[PDB]
Amino acid sequence: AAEIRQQFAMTAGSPIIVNDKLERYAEVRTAFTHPTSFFKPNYKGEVKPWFLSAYDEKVRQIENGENGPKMKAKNVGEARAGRALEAAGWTLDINYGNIYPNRFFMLWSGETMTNTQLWAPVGLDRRPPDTTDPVELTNYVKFAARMAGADLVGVARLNRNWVYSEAVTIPADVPYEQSLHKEIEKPIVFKDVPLPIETDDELIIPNTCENVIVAGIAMNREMMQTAPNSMACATTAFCYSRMCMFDMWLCQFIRYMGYYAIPSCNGVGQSVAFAVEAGLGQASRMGACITPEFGPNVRLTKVFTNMPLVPDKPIDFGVTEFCETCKKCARECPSKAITEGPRTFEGRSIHNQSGKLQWQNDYNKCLGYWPESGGYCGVCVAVCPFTKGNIWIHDGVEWLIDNTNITEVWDGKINTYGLDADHFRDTVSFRKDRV
Amino acid sequence: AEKEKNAAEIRQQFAMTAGSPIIVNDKLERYAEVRTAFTHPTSFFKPNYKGEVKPWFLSAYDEKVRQIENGENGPKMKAKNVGEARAGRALEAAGWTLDINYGNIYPNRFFMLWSGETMTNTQLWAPVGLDRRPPDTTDPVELTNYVKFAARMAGADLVGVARLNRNWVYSEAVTIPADVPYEQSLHKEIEKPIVFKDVPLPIETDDELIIPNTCENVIVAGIAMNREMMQTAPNSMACATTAFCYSRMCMFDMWLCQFIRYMGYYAIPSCNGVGQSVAFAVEAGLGQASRMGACITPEFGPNVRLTKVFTNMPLVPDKPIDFGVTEFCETCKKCARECPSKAITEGPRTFEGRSIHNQSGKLQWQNDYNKCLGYWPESGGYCGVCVAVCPFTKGNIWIHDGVEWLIDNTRNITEVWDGKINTYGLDADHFRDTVSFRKDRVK
Ligand code: SF4
Ligand code: SF4
Ligand code: SF4
Ligand code: SF4
């Protein structure tokens, strides 16, 4: 896997092609939050917040002994178990994605955390850094990242084009039980200040915030292959909580090294663009970052920091050319959300950011399928050739890409965090591949 | 030819018939948690390197600070430079992010809630009613398979089930009143009885922590530490793998408790609180007790952390295992010889506690745990030399002789930072050993 990555390393420079129309994107425009897409009917035809209508379908499926849309479970007990596993997975995640910045788990300073308080006498977060060498810092922080649950880790300079212009958040003193009903918009701005700070009016990231560290958190292949049914939902959910723990662990490490760190999970900016710039993978037709190790079957989170670091090289292992002819996700998508046409700089709707060259998908169609199916779908991820274990072959001199139920999952292979020992060697790391 | 390792085969070979293997007599009473060296007034205070008497972890902090300033990764162990010393301690500190006051011991506080009702996840999911709907599965065989699958998703490297032996549940917990904020927690610790009563649900009153009489089972998880890091004991990287695994324990408990609740049962998390993990682990078949006092497992030796969840969910208990640990420990004594505090006995097992920190009435090697704790401020960490030098901690201890499996009786920090690592510090060279199919989850 390390050989594959070195082989497809490209020269420095963001591979995302942009034009002069590109503007930063307000987070409220995503299909999850925008008022034009937020409300969906349930199976009874009642208009509700999309996730409430989706809950109605989960209840309906459990009652009827189903694991998904038109997918009968072995029995009601099995149906129940899948949704219990899904719901439990989300334990360390707020309101599907931890997007409110500097709230709950996503604090921009460590000062009030119980861990920081307990460790205060050592003064690790107050002491000036003892290492400023970006080479050594990159090795340290990547080692820490792996301890913190990343299966992949990369570094990029922070491209502000992918930072949301405005965040969706809640007022600071609103407790959790009012959060869903009191969501607001708040600008994210860059200023000459020493530390990340939030005011009544603004989320302020310092101009010194040079870098972004991006983590890939691998999902389980067997469970995702059940998309759009419940076990796909469960591997999705568990990985969101793994993302949260990753962000908290790594931000604390960085702070204890004498720098600042901003967590994000699904908030603050666009993870796919950061991941491509940090060399985890390449953008794809479906819109995900496709990695050599996992294809698109991997979640992303990221941490922003002033810690000096060595940016990784972007990687090009031919995804763009492959997606050009493939279109399997587009054909299998249950909502016809994914385009079969060519890449353009023009967004198909409010949910897309115009001004960058990408495949333009209709993401309101995608979200529409979630209440209908009672899950987070994932069919595109499941059917992508890159998701399958072996797409890689060797032609004698260099690596190249090859041209060509749920009861069973519960009774089948599993290992810690859903990782697969058959492939786990692919993410082994020594100093040579960290920096 | 070398037999491909089969960890499941190994466990089958050494499976015992049913019955708690811990030998006890009439001396045995439940143990008050306040008696542990961490909490007992006789041991909680330790001098620092200036001879100032402080809480043990504060004296240990003084030594970490001194070491960083002196460019050291441990007692009389020079680091590459001050930056490396700093990094080890930053890693250690960060590892503890999801753990309260070194162990999460206060029951029904912070992360260790005995009910899910107030958790943000529960509130978010409330309209589905998973925590209100009666169980759809009561078959212990299916439940055992479901809950073990969930346990692996939740980060357990090992999982086992036992009937709950109340002998190992603390008579009284250490906790804080419910109106005390975190900042005052260490100042305001109290004792509170853990009692069993005829109630539908785990509940806490002003006077008591009440576990229902229906709380039949304990689920025990092993959380694997990283071998390379632990073998730097007593230096900083051993402290770091210890720390990260405590946060993994916490995540495990919360994940699994929520799964069980959403299956229509109740679940009590614990991490280092509520009861004695090693006893539960032995009874749930994760491994065997040892001279040093830890549960030694076939997969990781003693280099594995433990947590446990208590529940009324019907389950199939696992069988205890005997792969010869007791007999090896009788003749080995390596941990005893290498222990920097001489805390571990070189003598035979007895039923009589060495001091207040030991629970009398059960046959075990009796160690002086006040001596152990005393070395922690001296070394500026959580030591772990015993775990590091234990032959069972070594990676390739199992061999096959053509007939059966057996133990192969043949048995710096810059390099660790520059060396092999993988997700959560797990090792792909061995990760196949914890693969699981239905057959090894339930008979
Ligand atoms: S399914 Fe085919 S077109 Fe779609 S993202 Fe994967 S490789 Fe690209
Ligand atoms: S998640 Fe499902 S509906 Fe959405 S784009 Fe992928 S295949 Fe289509
Ligand atoms: S070092 Fe030897 S005596 Fe001590 S626990 Fe390990 S096997 Fe037993
Ligand atoms: S942790 Fe260290 S001091 Fe304590 S028993 Fe083990 S070797 Fe001895």
Distance of CA A6 to CAs A142, A261, A316, A419, B166, Å? 17, 29, 10, 24, 57
Q: Which residues, 6 or more positions from A291, have their beta carbon under 8 angstroms from its beta carbon?
A: A152, A216, A280, A281, A298, A386
Distance of CA A272 to CAs A2, A275, A279, A302, A381, Å? 22, 5, 11, 10, 14
Q: Which amino acid is at B61?
A: Y
Tell which phi-psi region holds residue B114, choosing left (phi > 0), alpha (psi between -120 and 50) or beta: alpha
Closest CA to B154 of B62, B233, B93, B220: B220
Please identify among residues 405-424 of chain B the ones whose CB lies closer than 8 Å to any CB of chain A.
Answer: 417-424
Rg value, chain B, Cα:
21
CA distance B407 to B139: 37
Q: Helix A50-63 vs helix A363-373: angle between axes, to the nearest 10 degrees?
A: 30
Atom of ligand 3 nearest to the CA of B330: 3
CA distance B168 to B30: 7
Q: Which residues, 6 or more positions from A192, have their beta carbon under 8 angstroms from its beta carbon?
A: A206, A207
Three-state DSSP state, B412: coil
For β-strands A203-206 and A184-191, DSSP reports them as parallel
Contact A93, A236 (CB under 8 A): no
Nearest CB partner across the interface for B436, out of A79, A96, A414: A414
Three-state DSSP state, A409: helix
CA distance B301 to B292: 12
Contact B100, B109 (CB under 8 A): yes
Q: Looking at chain B, which residue has its C-alpha nearest residue A76? A: B136
Q: Is the CB of B328 under 6 A from ligand 3?
A: yes
Size of interface A-B (CB pairs under 8 A): 258
- Both structure tokens of B109: 């506080």
The ligand whose atoms approach the alpha carbon of B375 most closely is 4
CA distance B256 to A288: 30
Distance between Cα A64 and ligand 4 center (Å): 56
**CA distance from start to end of chain B:** 31
Q: How many residues does chain B have?
A: 443
CA distance B431 to B149: 16
Three-state DSSP state, A315: strand
Closest CA to A286 of A277, A294, A278, A295: A295
**Which residues from chain B sit within 8 angstroms of residue A62, using beta carbons?**
136
Helix (H) or strand (E) holding B147: helix B140-153
Number of CB atoms found within 10 A of residue A24's CB: 17
Rg value, chain A, Cα:
21
Distance of CA A27 to CAs A160, A225, A255, A267, Å? 14, 30, 27, 8
β partners of residue A257: none
- Both structure tokens of B429: 């060279």
B209: which DSSP letter? Answer: E
Three-state DSSP state, B333: coil
Class of residue B53 by CB neighbours under 10 A (exposed 0-12, middle 13-18, buried 19+): exposed
Tell which phi-psi region holds residue B102, choosing left (phi > 0), alpha (psi between -120 and 50) or beta: left
Asked if B13 has any chain A CB less than 8 Å from its own CB, the reply is no
CA distance B334 to B336: 5
Q: Where are the alpha helices (DSSP H) in B204-265?
A: 227-230, 236-262
Atom of ligand 4 nearest to the CA of B344: 5
Nearest CB partner across the interface for A59, out of B89, B102, B128: B128
Contact B296, B321 (CB under 8 A): no
Record the resolution, in angstroms.
1.6
CA distance B31 to B276: 9
The answer to whether the Cβ–Cβ distance between B136 and A62 falls below 8 Å is yes
**Cis, peptide link before residue B234, omega less than 30° from 0:** yes
CA distance A272 to A214: 10
Distance between Cα B333 and ligand 3 center (Å): 5
CA distance A178 to A103: 13
Q: HSE on the CB side for A385, CA within 13 Å?
A: 16
- The structure's method of determination equals X-ray
Closest CA to B182 of B237, B286, B101, B121: B101
| Residue B363, min C-alpha distance to chain A (Å) | 33
Sign of CA dihedral B44, B47, B48, B52: positive
Class of residue B415 by CB neighbours under 10 A (exposed 0-12, middle 13-18, buried 19+): exposed
**Residue having the nearest C-alpha atom to atom 7 of ligand 3:** B329
**Residue having the nearest C-alpha atom to atom 4 of ligand 3:** B335
Distance of CA B155 to CAs A84, B251, B261, B394, Å? 17, 8, 18, 22
**Which residues from chain A sit within 8 angstroms of residue B58, using beta carbons?**
121
Closest CA to A147 of B271, B417, B270: B417
The answer to whether the Cβ–Cβ distance between B93 and A122 falls below 8 Å is yes
Q: Which amino acid is at A145?
A: A
Q: Is the CB of B335 under 6 A from ligand 3?
A: yes
